[PDB]
Amino acid sequence: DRKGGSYSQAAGSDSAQS
Amino acid sequence: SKSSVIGWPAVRERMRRAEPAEEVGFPVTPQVPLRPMTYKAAVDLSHFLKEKGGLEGLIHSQRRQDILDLWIYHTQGYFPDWQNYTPGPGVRYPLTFGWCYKLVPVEDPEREVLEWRFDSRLAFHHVARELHPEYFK
Amino acid sequence: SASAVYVLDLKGKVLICRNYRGDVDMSEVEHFMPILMEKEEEGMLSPILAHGGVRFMWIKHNNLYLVATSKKNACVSLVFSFLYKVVQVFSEYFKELEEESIRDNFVIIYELLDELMDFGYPQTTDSKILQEYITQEAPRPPATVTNAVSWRSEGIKYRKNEVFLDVIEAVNLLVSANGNVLRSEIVGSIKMRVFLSGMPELRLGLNDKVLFDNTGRGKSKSVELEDVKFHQCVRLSRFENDRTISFIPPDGEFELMSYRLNTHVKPLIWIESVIEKHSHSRIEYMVKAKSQFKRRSTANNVEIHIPVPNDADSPKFKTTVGSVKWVPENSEIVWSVKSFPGGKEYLMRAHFGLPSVEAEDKEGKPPISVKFEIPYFTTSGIQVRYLKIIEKSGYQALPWVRYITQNGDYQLRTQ
Amino acid sequence: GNIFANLFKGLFGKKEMRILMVGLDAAGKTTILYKLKLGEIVTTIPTIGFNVETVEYKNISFTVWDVGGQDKIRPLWRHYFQNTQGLIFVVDSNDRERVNEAREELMRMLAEDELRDAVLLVFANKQDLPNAMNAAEITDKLGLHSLRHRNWYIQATCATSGDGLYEGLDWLSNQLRNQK
Ligand SMILES: Nc1nc2c(ncn2[C@@H]2O[C@H](COP(=O)(O)OP(=O)(O)OP(=O)(O)O)[C@@H](O)[C@H]2O)c(=O)[nH]1
Ligand SMILES: [Mg+2]
């Protein structure tokens, strides 16, 4: 856990835009 | 996908209930992955929708499309920006490559009645990219 | 074009001085303290002084005033930027900025001062890069300083590839005493702590309104960032061409981009406070805190400072939720709340005494400032879309980031 | 927490209480305070300042703060309004021309939002001349019944002899303490 919100994984790029 | 299968009937019922024509904030699931929908994921979703039905031939509406995008984002973590269609008038092609769904006239493009039509060639032919090369960069 | 970068103290003693041009006599510092005393006692004190034809432009540190003398028409902004870079370097090398390190770290301080700027022109300011040629515990300088990439040392290898992001929100609110909000600005700040192997070229992608309009997706929720200020690693040409955010992250925690846009939405916290101040008899504090934020989010450590009378004594607090403490050092009612669910409403009724004798001078009305910090809540609605981690060797990165929403200039004007 | 020590102290009496002594000059306030404390009529010059003393009676420390009625000391009554629980009004029925001024002073002092818990205590002083009125004519002239949320009680006390002081003290004790 961590104060201020749990860290979330990010994507690599806009997969929906090619 | 059991969750997707379960949400498909309720989502279809909600879309049908909404006619073809309160809480603030943007809560985010903790640790929930968020990323744009992928071509393979879009193709799988289109195939599942075609198999289960409810979207093919359904009248295209802003409320129904928004509800479907919100349900997809909730159940998978895909941003609701990949369900875009090319501007009219005429057949609207999906903006995201891989989506087999498109809007076709049923009769100003904003007043033309459109319905969702399955198209397997969209997952291989980038109609939206060819039509709008600037929109794809 | 500074002439001599010196380090002063709280008593007027020059802790450390390092002349860069020699055009100003070293005895001119003795007049800085009397000049500052004269300026502060007449309301004309300024960070940039003037001793005859010599100007003393400096900022105030925790315990020292970083004064830098000059004589010509030097760029004061350049001097301020050099002072800020020096302060950041001192903070990165020494965990504290006080007199205990100036008299103890003179061996490395002189080397850092000599290497940082020559003839009044700073040449190297990267603390991570500077930590490779000047140490307090010397080889040839690294090629990163000579190379174009002066913010990411080559050859860095880690067992894992973890990049932790921090989307920290800054809610600044300027509510007038009439009840309307004047200045309501949100300043985004993406602070990442990169730990990767090699020299990766991150390709950050968000849900920008301009990017969505250019792609043709200007219909979903997109952040309308009025001002976007990227770090030195971010290539300006790529962002200007097609809003492409491509830059090599450094090794450690740093500020990549700092968004800043206005907000026309209702405040997350609504503070309805009243003052039933009897003349020299007593006063009442009918303070009501309405949380307009989403009920799914919880604002950890809610601290709404309520400026009570400076001569208030014998205080009593009739509140609903949260500990209420009166701090006589700050002269305010610290409405401290640990957890405040969205949509909650805490009511407080203060009552304190007042001396019969009236005060000699006016005290002013400090504004009520809340200290809300709601994690996992993005008010601007900006969501990170992708982060293209590309490496020549080739590795599978594991990006991470969290959204923290806090209060910035969240002041409320009193009546 | 435990308050057994408080109960043990209350077994023999714990409450002390306080009291105020205000009014116009030459109202017999100092002589009355001296008789209450000592029991004799002492000769005192006009009170330029004030007199503060205490009275031990009925196990209650009756602290009395005498206040003069000087014109320059009329607006100085607000100094004793802080941390004050009681109030006693001393009228001067022997001064017809000063009765209106005393009533106006009492009304101005009764128009404060800080003194709300202080009950009214009207003391009829100078009860030795035939011109003095009864315990109702003065109250009717001052309109003591028109004091909303004010527990007033008129008591005639003779400065030369001392009759009625004990009844007034008993009434004040009954108004302060609400127990057996
Ligand atoms: N003859 C007679 N005179 C009295 C009696 N009681 C009060 N007085 C007069 O009232 C005056 C008031 O005396 P003090 O009580 O000592 O002073 P005070 O009432 O506090 O008045 P200030 O000191 O001016 O505020 C005295 O000088 C007496 O002359 C009384 O019972 N008989
Ligand atoms: Mg007297």
TrEMBL record, chain B:
<feature type="region of interest" description="Mediates dimerization, Nef-PTE1 interaction">
    <location>
        <begin position="66"/>
        <end position="82"/>
    </location>
</feature>
<feature type="modified residue" description="Phosphoserine; by host">
    <location>
        <position position="1"/>
    </location>
</feature>
<protein>
    <recommendedName>
        <fullName>C-terminal core protein</fullName>
    </recommendedName>
</protein>
<dbReference type="Pfam" id="PF00469">
    <property type="entry name" value="F-protein"/>
</dbReference>
<dbReference type="InterPro" id="IPR001558">
    <property type="entry name" value="HIV_Nef"/>
</dbReference>
<feature type="site" description="Might play a role in AP-1 recruitment to the Nef-MHC-I complex">
    <location>
        <position position="15"/>
    </location>
</feature>
<dbReference type="InterPro" id="IPR027481">
    <property type="entry name" value="HIV-1_Nef_core_sf"/>
</dbReference>
<feature type="short sequence motif" description="PxxP; stabilizes the interaction of NEF/MHC-I with host AP1M1; necessary for MHC-I internalization">
    <location>
        <begin position="30"/>
        <end position="33"/>
    </location>
</feature>
<dbReference type="InterPro" id="IPR027480">
    <property type="entry name" value="HIV-1_Nef_anchor_sf"/>
</dbReference>
<feature type="region of interest" description="SH3-binding; interaction with Src family tyrosine kinases">
    <location>
        <begin position="27"/>
        <end position="36"/>
    </location>
</feature>
